[PDB]
Amino acid sequence: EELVDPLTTVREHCEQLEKCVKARERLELCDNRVSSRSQTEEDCTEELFDFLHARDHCVAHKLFKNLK
Amino acid sequence: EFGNLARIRHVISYSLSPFEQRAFPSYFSKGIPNVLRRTRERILRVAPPFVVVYLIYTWGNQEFEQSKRKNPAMYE
Amino acid sequence: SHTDVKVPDFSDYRRASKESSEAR
Amino acid sequence: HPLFKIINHSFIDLPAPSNISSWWNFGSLLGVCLMVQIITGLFLAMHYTSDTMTAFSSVTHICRDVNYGWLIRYMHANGASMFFICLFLHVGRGLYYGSYTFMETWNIGVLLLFAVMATAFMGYVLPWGQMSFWGATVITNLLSAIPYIGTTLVEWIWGGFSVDKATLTRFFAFHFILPFIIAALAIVHLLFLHETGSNNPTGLNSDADKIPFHPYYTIKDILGILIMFLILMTLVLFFPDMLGDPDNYMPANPLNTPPHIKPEWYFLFAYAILRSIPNKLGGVLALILSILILALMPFLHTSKQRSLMFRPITQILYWILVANLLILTWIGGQPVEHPFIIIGQLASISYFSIILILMPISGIIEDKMLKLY
Amino acid sequence: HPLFKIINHSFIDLPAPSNISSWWNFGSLLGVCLMVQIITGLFLAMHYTSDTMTAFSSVTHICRDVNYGWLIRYMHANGASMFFICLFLHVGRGLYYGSYTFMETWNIGVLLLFAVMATAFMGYVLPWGQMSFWGATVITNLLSAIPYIGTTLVEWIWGGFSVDKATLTRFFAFHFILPFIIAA
Amino acid sequence: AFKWRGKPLFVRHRTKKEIDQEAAVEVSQLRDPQHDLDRVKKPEWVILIGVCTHL
Amino acid sequence: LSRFLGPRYRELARNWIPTAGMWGTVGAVGLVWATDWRLILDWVPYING
Amino acid sequence: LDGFRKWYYNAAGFNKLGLMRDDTLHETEDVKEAIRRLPEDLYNDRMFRIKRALDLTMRHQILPKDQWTKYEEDKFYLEPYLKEVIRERKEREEWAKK
Amino acid sequence: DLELHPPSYPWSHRGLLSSLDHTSIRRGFQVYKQVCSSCHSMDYVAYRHLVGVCYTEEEAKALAEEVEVQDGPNDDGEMFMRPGKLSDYFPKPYPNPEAARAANNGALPPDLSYIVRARHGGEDYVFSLLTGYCEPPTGVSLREGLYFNPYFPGQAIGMAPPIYTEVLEYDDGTPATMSQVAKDVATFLRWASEPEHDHRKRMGLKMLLMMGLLLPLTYAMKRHKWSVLKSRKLAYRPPK
Amino acid sequence: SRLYSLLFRRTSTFALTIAVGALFFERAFDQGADAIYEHIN
Ligand SMILES: CCCCCCCCCCCCCCCCCC(=O)OC[C@H](COP(=O)(O)OCCN)OC(=O)CCCCCCCCCCCCCCCCC
Ligand code: HEC
Ligand code: HEM
Ligand code: HEM
Ligand code: HEM
């Protein structure tokens, strides 16, 4: 019986919002870009940091109500 | 010390006992007007330097961020 | 002289009678 | 008793101006803060050990095992911060109201300011955290800038090739002994002032209106002490780490360097200046001048009015000076990268140009406007 | 000049009796000894550690590895002895020549004498030798004599059941701080 | 580094490229004129003291 | 300073100059000796060592 | 320039305390010599004006607007007496210089 | 430097007078004992600090006697290990930091006693780091013994992710979800870095009540003793 | 008015009332304050 980590359920519920899906779209393009260009040193951290910043901001808005 | 501090003449000075007068006569009655009177004589000398400190601080922060933000044109 | 004027009014200061002094 | 005379001559029957504002409280607060620091420092000294193996352990033992030892330690740290807040406001009062014309009092003041900064620096080195060790090396290195005898002096102070136990123990001794010299210099500060009496915010001769100090400026100092204690205890009991650095809670690792090295916030203005000047020596000198420019201040007064109550252009220049002092405090915090650097360079240029050039020229212009010049 | 005025009135022109003997030197010697002690004490404080594991080791490190550290340590110890020699001769001068009729000066003196004895006692405890530890226990025990609050007071000072590190460190702090009160 | 004398004793090994670039560096154009080899007995081996000339 | 740009003021200084130099000399010698500055003391034949 | 000087006189704010311009001068040695040479009535008015300004600053008040010191009305009484002090002072200085 | 800045979480001790939840400190101590104690040390925390906070005297005595602690030289002149005492500190994972370097692929696991105090925004950081082992994005590659934790400086923390959902079972039975475990250990580490958090806040509440009583009264005394002057009326009466 | 004439006019009595009050105030303050802190947390 998988013990649901409320954090996971809150995480995809927060990824359903709009700033997270826009940053994920840049993340995708960014990662595709890095993937497409076989030899390059352009990482996706900035995009990824922006997506994680927005997502964990709205996660930390409402995570602790589900924790005993 | 007292007695040899200064020379004044014909300056009468009336006063009242502390217990005989109200402790906070019209404290908020005139206090507010006065505090407001005061703020309007000093706000134009005081505030605009701190306003442009706030603008420079924000500017620096944002500029720094943009500086850090990766150059899209670069690495492509 | 010294009687030309009277002590200025302190009504806005003065509170509103030994009876009261004890309390005051 | 003859002493009672001295007791009265300075605190009871002293003729004080009747119209001095709450800013004149601050110096008395500084004296109280000094005592508070000394008292708390004494109760830190009964359990602190100045050994590099045991200094961090002794500090944690104070915080965890001594009854109310955390209270005395954080009272000491936030009382150092309160000391520098009251010191900066005292110096700002002296600059704004023209109190620097009491030249001997001003010079004993800037000596006291140098002594207090040295005491706080060595005290911050004392807990032997990560931040203390890298901070010490940094400023001790500052001395190496000296053109010829620098290396020797640095090594002398360090007491060895690099800061190590040799330093910690002598820094404990010096940090212990300097606040008593500060107390003696404060007694000289009070003497050089009573000869002339305090100044008033209008800047005029207040000899016609002076009142006693016992019932008028004593209860006022008691109220200011109560408000300062309120701010100190809400700094200690509610936000005990808003002014300190988290990296000081790690032990001192000589192998590991922190990603960003700072002194505590009241040294920042200086830090900014130092970083601004490209030349190392230049930085050190400018840094010193930053504090010393004040001493130089009584020779720059070119106005026929002592205070800034009736001087609006120099009031504007004064608040611009307070503004870019706050800017230099912010920059010090910011890391080395655009555009923090340029601001730092300008802010330092503007600071020295306002104190050195702009205020006497403005005072000449203000004297010209009143048909005095 | 308000700082120099003091000296002129006190050290440069003070009207002094022309016939005072060499015994009147001794009090000035005491002041010099106080400074000497403070200066030597400061140079002991840059290497001494007030930890019971390391106090004896720090004292031996002062005597053996610090440049002229033996000189400063033995100057401090024999300067404490010289302080008490000059103190006893100062008190004997005051008793012999009737100087105790200056009553306030005499009472501030006996307060200074109590402070100097307490400072020297805790300073002798400080090197943490065999003799220091048994000496401390002994006099601290003296306090226990108090009729009702004695036990508590002793334990307070000791900072524990028996003198141990708790004492050494607070004795270092008190021995550091009292000569400035003596100067005041 | 082995914290020799209370200071980080940086001891480093360099690569063909590493050694190649350092030599390429313009000694005169260097802030401090000291060609890589000038400070190393072995190109593959460079040893330095870790105290920033600055502070 | 206006008052200090004076004729007698200059005379006074000129008369005072020699003494001033002497004092600097004493200090210089003093510093050399107190610091045991050897760069300078190495020149002196006997003082050497 | 005249209107801008009146605006600066209002912005300086010592007229709101009932002070003159010469009351606001910092008492140096020359200013105290000029004050000592004043006649008794002018000195008494100056001391009363300074005491009233100190009392108003104590209570953090100002005078009513009809009681302020009109720029046009302010009298530079100490000025004449001061110039002399400076003149005499300089003359003496020059003599010493030479 | 460039680092993800952990968000603000609504902690039960975040408020100005809000104390710590002691059941969470007990659960976080269990989390440290079963997971974090294998690599990290707690040199300035003893078992007797747990009495009156999370455990009773007998519970903390049993917790201390579960472990073995070398304690002193036998009369025969040698070392020996004994069951821990309420006076014993928490056991070392390694005898010296070089053993920690050897056992953790060159990395040194730091003292977790003051980690929350030593890490900027510690409580958050801790939670974030323990719950921030996300996959490295394209363009970044980490060597063995490294993990892309956005929050960790450099995003390359040697520590492998130590909290897998249901890593340990809470004795209280509260579901041991990764988060419930990270929040408990962040509360505990917080407690560790400041065992007096609760006592202080009580002192601060008494201080606010006393200052709210004493400031208007001292202000009233000052305004009494300053009313006299503040009512003084001056009049100039040249004899004329 | 009675209080002034009884415990607040003679300085000795003024001190007495202060000391006695303070002796009890602590009891009350601590009790009341603790109630509040507990209620809060
Ligand atoms: C000034 C033009 C005239 C303004 C007239 C306003 C109306 C006056 C008549 C109606 C009454 C309104 C309220 C009056 C209050 C008291 C009188 C007053 O405030 O006057 C205006 C004031 C002072 O004027 P005054 O000194 O007479 O002459 C102006 C010289 N510019 O001057 C001011 O208020 C403006 C001051 C502006 C200061 C701006 C400073 C900007 C720079 C800050 C830099 C900070 C650091 C930045 C970084 C540095 C390092 C890189
Ligand atoms: C219990 C769930 C915890 C918690 C709350 C933390 N850890 Fe560890 N840790 C381990 C190692 C080898 C390191 C150092 C890695 C490196 O420096 O590269 C760490 C580090 C930490 C930190 C410090 C982070 C920092 O910025 O310095 C923190 C806050 C932390 N951990 C929390 C090793 C281990 C373990 C052995 C596999 C386990 C178990 C834990 N840690 C458990 C925990
Ligand atoms: C003579 C009186 C004083 C004594 C005996 C004393 C003693 C001590 C001791 C033992 C410590 C180490 C304990 C600790 O870590 O807090 C310390 C720390 C410190 N002291 Fe003092 N001190 C005195 C006065 C002062 C003064 C006047 C200042 C302010 C200038 C000051 C500033 C500091 C600072 C900043 C620290 C570091 C606090 C920290 O760990 O964050 N001390 N002092
Ligand atoms: C060690 C900390 C200090 C203490 C304890 C201290 C103490 C005092 C005290 C008690 C006063 C008289 C009350 C008052 O006017 O506020 C005073 C006034 C004064 N102090 Fe200080 N002071 C300190 C630092 C300084 C410094 C650093 C300066 C120099 C910048 C300075 C310059 C002055 C001046 C000029 C006055 C006169 C105030 C006036 O008449 O306007 N003080 N100080
Ligand atoms: C503030 C100034 C002083 C400081 C910092 C200071 C510091 C020290 C230190 C660190 C020691 C231990 C080193 C040692 O074993 O000698 C010591 C020892 C001692 N001090 Fe002081 N001291 C001071 C003033 C004095 C004074 C005024 C006296 C005399 C009353 C005194 C009497 C002693 C004695 C008797 C010892 C024991 C010496 C021994 O080991 O035989 N000290 N002091």
Give residue D40's domain range: 1-373
Q: Interhelix angle for D165-194 vs E26-45, to 10°?
A: 140
Report the distance separating Cα I137 and Cα A47, nearest Å: 10
Number of domains in chain D: 1
CB D346 within 8 A of CB D354: no
Report the distance separating Cα H78 and Cα H42, nearest Å: 9
Does the CA dihedral E156-E161-E166-E172 come out positive or negative? positive
Report the distance separating Cα H26 and Cα D303, nearest Å: 8
Taking an 8 Å cut-off on Cβ atoms, the answer to whether B21 and C24 are in contact is: no
Q: Write out the two tokens for D350.
A: 């503007």
Report the distance separating Cα G27 and Cα G44, nearest Å: 17
Report the distance separating Cα A30 and Cα A39, nearest Å: 14
Report the distance separating Cα E55 and Cα E172, nearest Å: 11
Q: Write out the two tokens for F31.
A: 């802030």
Taking an 8 Å cut-off on Cβ atoms, the answer to whether H53 and D202 are in contact is: yes
Please name the member of B9, B37, B38 whose beta carbon is closest to the beta carbon of H44. B9
Tell me, in angstroms, the distance from the centre of ligand 5 to residue D91's CA: 38
Q: Write out the two tokens for I53.
A: 């906070």
Tell me, in angstroms, the distance from the centre of ligand 4 to residue I188's CA: 46
Determine phi and psi for D112, rounding to 5 degrees. -65, -35
I36 to chain A nearest CA, in Å? Answer: 20
Tell me, in angstroms, the distance from the centre of ligand 4 to residue D100's CA: 10
Whether the link from the prior residue into I238 is cis, omega within 30° of 0, is no
Minimum-distance ligand 2 atom for the alpha carbon of I32: 1
What's the CA angle centered on D290, arms D285 and D292, to 5 degrees?
Answer: 85
Q: Considering only CA atoms, which of B30, E127, I206, F39 is closest in space to residue H59?
A: B30
Q: DSSP secondary structure string, I121-161?
A: THHHHHHHHHT--PPP-TT----TT----TTSGGG--SS--
Q: Write out the two tokens for E59.
A: 């004292």
> Half-sphere exposure of residue D267, counting CA atoms within 13 Å on the CB side?
22
Q: DSSP secondary structure string, G10-35?
A: HHHHHHHHHHHHHHHHHHHHHHHHHT
Q: Considering only CA atoms, which of D268, D226, D1 is closest in space to residue I211?
A: D226
Residues of D in contact with E176 (CB under 8 A): 45, 176-177
Please name the member of I4, I138, I174 whose beta carbon is closest to the beta carbon of A49. I4
CB E141 within 8 A of CB E163: no
Cβ contacts of D203 within 8 Å, gap of 6 or more: D97, D98, D305, D306, D307, D308, D309, D310, H24, H26
Report the distance separating Cα C1 and Cα D346, nearest Å: 66
Asked how this structure was determined, the answer is cryo-EM
From residue E49, give the alpha-carbon distance in Å to each of D158, F31, I155: 17, 45, 42
Residues of D in contact with E47 (CB under 8 A): 166, 169-170
Residues of D assigned a catalytic role: 194, 198, 220-221, 264
Q: Considering only CA atoms, which of A48, A3, A53 is closest in space to residue A26?
A: A48
In short, whether D105's Cβ falls inside 6 Å of ligand 4 is yes
Report the distance separating Cα F32 and Cα E2, nearest Å: 55
I window 1-20, beta carbon within 8 A of J:
17-19
Report the distance separating Cα D344 and Cα D274, nearest Å: 10
Q: How many CB atoms lie within 10 A of CB H96?
A: 11
Report the distance separating Cα D123 and Cα D48, nearest Å: 12
J window 1-20, beta carbon within 8 A of C:
1, 4-5
